[PDB]
RNA sequence: GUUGCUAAGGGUCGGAUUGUUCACCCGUAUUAGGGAUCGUGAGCUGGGUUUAGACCGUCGUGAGCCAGGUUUGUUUUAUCC
RNA sequence: GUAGCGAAAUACCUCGUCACUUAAUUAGUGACCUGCAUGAACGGAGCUAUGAGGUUCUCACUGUCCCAAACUGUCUCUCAG
RNA sequence: AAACAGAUCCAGAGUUAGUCGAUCCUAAUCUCAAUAAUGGGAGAAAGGGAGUACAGUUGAUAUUCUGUAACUGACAACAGUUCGCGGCAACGCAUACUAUUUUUCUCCGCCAAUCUUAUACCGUUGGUAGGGAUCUCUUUCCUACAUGACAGUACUAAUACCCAGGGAAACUGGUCAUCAGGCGAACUGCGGCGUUCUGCUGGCAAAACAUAGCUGUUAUGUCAAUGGCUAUUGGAUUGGUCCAUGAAGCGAAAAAUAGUUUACUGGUCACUCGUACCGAUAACCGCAUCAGGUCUUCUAGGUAAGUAGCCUAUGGCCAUUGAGGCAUGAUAGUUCAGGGAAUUCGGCCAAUUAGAGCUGUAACUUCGGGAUAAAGCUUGGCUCUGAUGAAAAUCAGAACCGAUUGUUACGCGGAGAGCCCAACUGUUUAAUAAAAACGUAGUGUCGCGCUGUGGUAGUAUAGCCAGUGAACGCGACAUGAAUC
RNA sequence: GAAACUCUGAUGGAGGACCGUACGGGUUAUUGAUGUGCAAAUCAUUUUUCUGAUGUAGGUAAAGGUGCGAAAGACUCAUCG
């Protein structure tokens, strides 16, 4: 019951400053994990927009390798760059294609 | 032990049965007085060495 | 990032054994542990497996090489001066 | 005096070769009268020795243990014989190969196995046919009668390069001397007592001794420099 | 101030370097030196001296040597009269 | 006796001579060199890294000390065996 | 000390196996024999090695006994089936024996990472059985919520590898990471196959356990949902490292080539020897019930980075003479005004420092280090807010609160500036010396091409070590990293 | 950036690297306790090392003017020039 107590309260973040750490930020929680957290969040995104049809084969590879360096940090990094992405390029893609072929 | 030989196990028989207070009847029969059995020992004071 | 400036492979070693060495190992460690371009199936995959001996991954089959090349240079001239007699006659 | 680590490795108790992992004794096959094919099955590398071994397989199979020339691969076809032509790999008597080239594994006598130019990165170079004796050069310089009938495998050695490379760590000679053998490490002569050694004793370490000695000295006194018909920095010549 | 006599009741020191005794400087209340198994190790300490490890220098063909230098090196027992 | 090094882990005379270090230094550091007896794989000069290694100083901190004192645990004290 | 106690004394009693071990095989190594020979034997109760599980029972035995359910091998006849077919392929399904050769399993270093069963533990959701607690508060707290070897066949879904189609640069697919591909990628098959996985059964509730009641047995009940950022173990997928490449043999199966052929599935028996208990805490070695020494196994919760230190359930315990005093002293400890090494051969000793986060880091350097350099700050409690994940976790930010205090106990570097020696990790006088001594890499010199060289060995013309060796080697010395 | 290539961040997990656990391996200091010892080499606090030239078990090899020795004349059943 006395751990129960400090549990619950773990939750809401009692007892979880900078005084009662002995770990650092690498022992607490390991900067491989949060590597390892990322990327398969990033690379399953990918994948369904893929089978989707949204992205292409050629749109995938560019932002599949660009997963494997630092420019996403996030989901909704990565989703406001595709949303970005396609209404820059794809408006064009369209646009510019289409007309000048018979002309 | 465990795991002892046969004749290891033959060693540690004769050795305990051997074992044991002189019998009553010989001071009667013979009228010596003081014969201690030989072979008496305890476990922990006199080890065997066999 | 490149991370050392001078050193390269023989980081690992540390401050220990002196600069003269570390720049001996530094050309032959490179070398050893370097894929190169396999005769049999094409592919460059071939590794060092023990001294003498180069394992190709893909090909399943072995060379005998040099200790840390797959080419030592004079046995690459024996190659040469067997090839001039035998073209010859 | 104490009989003295030099005098000690001929009784042999500690000081013998470690031979537990070590795959075979390497040489040809036996002689048996003409030319040979001969599949490389697998090349293969024992503990101690520096070069490669190549297990041949002359198909019933066979099989024979020749130490490896460079630029042999597995599923070549070597040929062991007198009408086998010139490759690298090839086993030709010393009769037929042409003078002034590179060769391995050379006899002393014929169907013997195989003596000079055995370890990695060393060729016997040929000088030239006398009529039964062909002359050869051995690594070292010195040159010698052998004669014609007895074999030899063609080009250099494989594994050539390995002392280029200087071993860093104590550890790493441990790792050297325990596929080989116990002799190692050496603590010097002069460090010892004057029972131990006949360098040792003295307030100050020094040798004290003139400390170069004859043919003619017994055992326990050949220590040092044995015969030394020249000494110190070789400058020219 | 220099010096003679009677007087040993009392006083006669803090520090820097040195194993020091001794010496020599800084500072103060002016300022002597000695004995007691060179008082005092079952009261201490072990810096020195003086073992076995090790280094330097001269000497010795060498093992080894050296009031020549340097460093690491076990200090027991009272309950008897 | 060349190059280096040089009262040195080697320099007896010696507490060498002159600076820095200190209120005060036979210690420490840096120079000079009539090197008792330095010296080049008998290896010479060097110290970035490492050291339960040797040695000198400064800051921090302290019962090591001026100068001792109080309290606490088990024994020492008394009785039975 | 005491004693009715005891590992003491005395009298009896106790160790049950085809499946656990030994037995069988060889390793380092040892020892005989033959040379008409090409070996035989020994050598491991931690290697190899066919086959067992649960429940119950005794004052002491249990994987050994009893009950129940398996499994392995050998030797017999005998009854019924059967005399080779499916798939383009990967492969599937009912097929012999002797011999030779070939190959495989047995079968193999160390280190690192990812994923995942089982077991333990912590969890969000509820629940029912009993017990504990209660002035007040707590729909609370604790215990319980379980299924063996073995045998089966569903489709879910994995990764490895292979097969059929397919035929790739505007290069595409893929990992935590390296990467893969015209010697054929993506991709499609209700492909093939191996190893793991989820569910559903058999074993199987008849047992076992917990409540309730009756005098041995009758009742109900052991349920439903779904996470782990935690650990250990088994396994899978891989990588790195080596002048280091990490057992053998018995045994088993397969294949090929000959020859001889019908085969397959479904009662009896299982020899021999060990088996108790201790395993340091009094059962072992130290003369002893000695604060010493000696190989391994199963390993709970909280705090924390933790297999640290500190506290506590299960389990095991009070091992330790008592009664009374408390000055002095010895020893192990907290604390000491003002000064701060004046003590002392000497800062010996102790004190200060300390964890983490955010700043900030010099001379010199072999450019790797120095570096946790140094020097500053912040750290609690309580009520919240936000971001990242799937995720019950972890990180960031703000209020307000009181003795300005907070790595609160526990655990955790005092630091800097010169000089000497040895480069470095390492080794050493068991019992006064751990160092500058030894060692090492690096450098150098000498000897020798096997009928040889450096040893050893001893009367047998024994054969042993370097040598399963061959100058990029073997042996003999001296210096002791680098730089000049 | 014309080029040869070299700036920032992540990924990765090398090293006879470092801190640090133990019924691990060693044994520095207090020259503490004990020294009629618990002990014919112990105890406490402190200290060193902790994936390696590592520790450790069983079997096995080497025997007295011999053995073995990362060398101290160390060790060879409390015995060793």
């Not at chain 1, 990033?42 to 599949?64: A, P």
């Not at chain 3, 893909?58 to 001039?84: F, H």
């Not at chain 4, 006598?109 to 006398?130: K, L």
């Amino acid at each position: 019951a006395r751990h129960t107590k400090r549990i619950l309260a773990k939750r809401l973040g009692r007892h979880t400053g900078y005084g009662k750490r002995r770990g650092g930020r690498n022992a607490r929680l390991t900067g491989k994990f949060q590597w390892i957290r990322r990327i398969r969040v990033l690379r399953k995104v990918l994948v369904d927009y893929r089978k989707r049809n949204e992205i292409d084969c050629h749109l995938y590879r560019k932002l599949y390798l660009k997963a494997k360096g630092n420019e996403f940090r996030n989901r909704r990094n990565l989703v406001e760059h595709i949303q970005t992405l396609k209404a820059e390029n794809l408006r064009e893609k369209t646009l510019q294609s289409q007309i000048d072929a018979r002309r | 032990a465990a795991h002892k030989t046969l004749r290891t196990k033959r060693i540690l028989c004769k050795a305990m049965k051997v074992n044991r207070p002189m019998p009553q009847f010989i001071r009667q029969m013979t009228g010596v007085r003081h014969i201690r059995n030989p072979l008496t020992r305890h476990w922990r004071r006199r080890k065997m060495n066999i | 990032a490149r991370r050392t400036k001078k050193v390269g492979i023989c980081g690992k070693y540390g401050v220990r054994y002196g600069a003269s060495l570390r720049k001996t190992i530094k050309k032959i460690e490179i070398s050893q542990r370097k894929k190169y371009p396999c005769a049999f199936c094409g592919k460059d995959s071939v590794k060092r497996n023990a001294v003498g001996i180069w394992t190709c991954t893909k090909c399943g089959k072995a060379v005998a090489g040099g200790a840390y090349t797959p080419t030592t240079p004079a046995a690459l001239t024996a190659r040469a001066a067997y090839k001039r007699i035998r073209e010859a006659q | 005096g104490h009989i003295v680590r030099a005098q000690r490795r001929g009784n042999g108790s500690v000081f013998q070769a470690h031979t537990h992992h070590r795959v075979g004794p390497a040489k040809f096959r036996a002689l048996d009268a003409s030319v040979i094919s001969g599949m490389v099955k697998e090349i293969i590398h024992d503990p101690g020795r520096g070069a490669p071994l190549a297990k041949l397989i002359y198909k019933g199979f066979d099989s024979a243990l020749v130490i490896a020339p460079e630029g042999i691969h597995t599923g070549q076809f070597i040929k062991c014989g007198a009408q086998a032509d010139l490759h690298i790999g090839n086993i030709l008597p010393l009769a037929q190969i042409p003078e002034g080239t590179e060769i391995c594994n050379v006899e002393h006598r014929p169907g013997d196995g195989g003596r000079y130019g055995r370890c990695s990165g060393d060729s016997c170079r040929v000088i030239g046919h006398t009529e039964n004796y062909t002359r050869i050069q051995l690594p070292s310089g010195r040159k010698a009668l052998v004669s014609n009938i007895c074999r030899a495998t063609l080009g250099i050695v494989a594994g050539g390069g390995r002392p280029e490379k200087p071993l860093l760590k104590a550890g790493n000679v441990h790792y050297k001397y325990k596929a080989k053998r116990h002799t190692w490490p050496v603590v010097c002569g002069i460090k010892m007592n004057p029972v131990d050694h006949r360098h040792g004793g003295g307030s100050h370490q020094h040798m004290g001794a003139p400390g170069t000695v004859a043919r003619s000295a017994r055992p326990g006194q050949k220590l040092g420099l044995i015969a030394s018909r020249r000494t110190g920095r070789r400058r020219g010549t």
